[PDB]
Design an enzyme around this catalytic site. Structure first.
Site, PDB file in Angstrom:
ATOM      1  CB  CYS A   1       1.999  -1.814 -11.939  1.00 42.53           C
ATOM      2  SG  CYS A   1       1.763  -0.964 -13.513  1.00 42.53           S
TER       3      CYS A   1
ATOM      4  CG  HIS B   1      -3.027  -2.911 -10.133  1.00 42.05           C
ATOM      5  ND1 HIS B   1      -3.294  -2.316  -8.917  1.00 42.05           N
ATOM      6  CD2 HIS B   1      -1.865  -2.368 -10.569  1.00 42.05           C
ATOM      7  CE1 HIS B   1      -2.356  -1.428  -8.648  1.00 42.05           C
ATOM      8  NE2 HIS B   1      -1.466  -1.451  -9.623  1.00 42.05           N
TER       9      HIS B   1
ATOM     10  CG  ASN C   1     -10.089  -4.707  -7.744  1.00 51.52           C
ATOM     11  OD1 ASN C   1      -9.349  -5.677  -7.937  1.00 51.52           O
ATOM     12  ND2 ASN C   1      -9.658  -3.554  -7.217  1.00 51.52           N
TER      13      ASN C   1
ATOM     14  NE  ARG D   1      -3.581  -0.242  -0.007  1.00 46.04           N
ATOM     15  CZ  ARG D   1      -4.189  -0.026  -1.166  1.00 46.04           C
ATOM     16  NH1 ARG D   1      -4.219  -0.952  -2.116  1.00 46.04           N
ATOM     17  NH2 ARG D   1      -4.781   1.148  -1.374  1.00 46.04           N
TER      18      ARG D   1
HETATM   19 MG   LIG Z   1      -7.475  -6.342  -8.352  1.00 44.19          MG
HETATM   20 ZN   LIG Z   2       1.125  -2.890 -14.654  1.00 47.26          ZN
END
Ligand SMILES: [Mg+2]
Ligand SMILES: [Zn+2]
Ligand SMILES: [Mg+2]
Ligand SMILES: [Zn+2]
Ligand SMILES: [Zn+2]
Ligand SMILES: [Zn+2]
Lengths: 162, 162
Positions: A104, A97, A118, A60
């Site tokens: 990233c 992500h 998600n 985090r």
């Molecule tokens: Mg995720």
């Molecule tokens: Zn990435």
DNA sequence: TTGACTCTCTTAA
DNA sequence: GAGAGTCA
DNA sequence: TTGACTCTCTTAA
DNA sequence: GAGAGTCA
């Protein structure tokens, strides 16, 4: 309150800084037996991380800027979406992500969606394997596959029907 | 309890009691535009639930038996699997509803698998829509679909590539 | 104003 | 998705 | 012995 | 997947 112009300046400063994160080439499953490439902009493993960034947990981080003497702080992946609605269908929007790589911060690898949406990307067959996400996955989910179930449905007697 | 005989006795007692729970017919999506029917054996909404059963959370129950003059207690859905390994690849095995109906205690609707495998069934396209689970799903997952993503990947400048 | 740490919290299986 | 304690 | 409640915990997004 | 505090 921060103005739209001030928010755009935060996004721009964040992009400038993240654009200098090491760019790492990853070969990833796309589904359907195909392989593709993603380019992740990875925050460093230890301090210093970049101007404005600090680690609040193992995976985090937060981004912090001081505007007109007031300290503003955001989740480090939320910054691309500061001009977006923060909830949908009564559910909080989360940074999500598409590359499944927490370090990233490439905004081309992020979307803004409910926590359920998600999570579900973890099991998606991928953009070449049958992804039905309206905002398409960039890769097959890391947990896609037959699974490792230890024991299936079963009864010892005859009390049940399926 | 410790002995195999005692464990079989627990499973048999649990099946007999659960077998007397109301059988509720649920029509469910299978994927591929097809619909099927499941017969869930549903624990009552309020006490009494059945011999040996008690509610420890809104949708959590436990099964309890006195063996060797000692109380032995288990999560209500774990009892069918008491003779199975309790872990896999170092991950804890969980009771996992193929019908996604927590009140159901039909062991023909339960499997025993990692929490990750468990969760992932929420998004499975289902047995007629492409389920690849080795222990096959009984229905399309309740969260399968395009999602409701608010914002997709985007950048303001030219710092990033996918 | 900034960095580098600290702490706890949310959700739904 | 879990374990365990307090009462009656 | 059995029932009906109470509490907090685990995981990985 | 989050928010917020402390200290220099
Ligand atoms: Mg995720
Ligand atoms: Zn990435
Ligand atoms: Mg489940
Ligand atoms: Zn997808
Ligand atoms: Zn069921
Ligand atoms: Zn499946």
């Amino acid at each position: 309150a921060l103005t739209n112009a001030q928010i755009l300046a935060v996004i721009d400063s964040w992009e400038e800084t993240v654009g200098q994160f090491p760019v790492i080439t990853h070969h990833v499953p796309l589904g359907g037996g195909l392989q593709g490439t993603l380019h992740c902009y990875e925050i460093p493993l230890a301090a210093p991380y970049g101007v404005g960034f600090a680690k609040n947990g193992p995976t985090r981080w937060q981004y912090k800027r001081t505007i007109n003497q007031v300290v503003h702080r955001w989740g480090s992946h939320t910054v691309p979406f500061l001009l977006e609605p923060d909830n949908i269908n009564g559910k909080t929007c989360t940074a999500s992500h598409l590359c499944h790589n927490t370090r990233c911060h490439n905004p081309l690898h992020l979307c803004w969606e409910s926590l359920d949406d998600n999570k579900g990307r973890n099991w998606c067959p991928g953009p070449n394997g049958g992804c039905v996400h309206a905002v398409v996955c960039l890769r097959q989910g890391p947990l896609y596959g037959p699974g490792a179930t230890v024991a299936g449905p079963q009864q010892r007697g005859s009390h049940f029907v399926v």
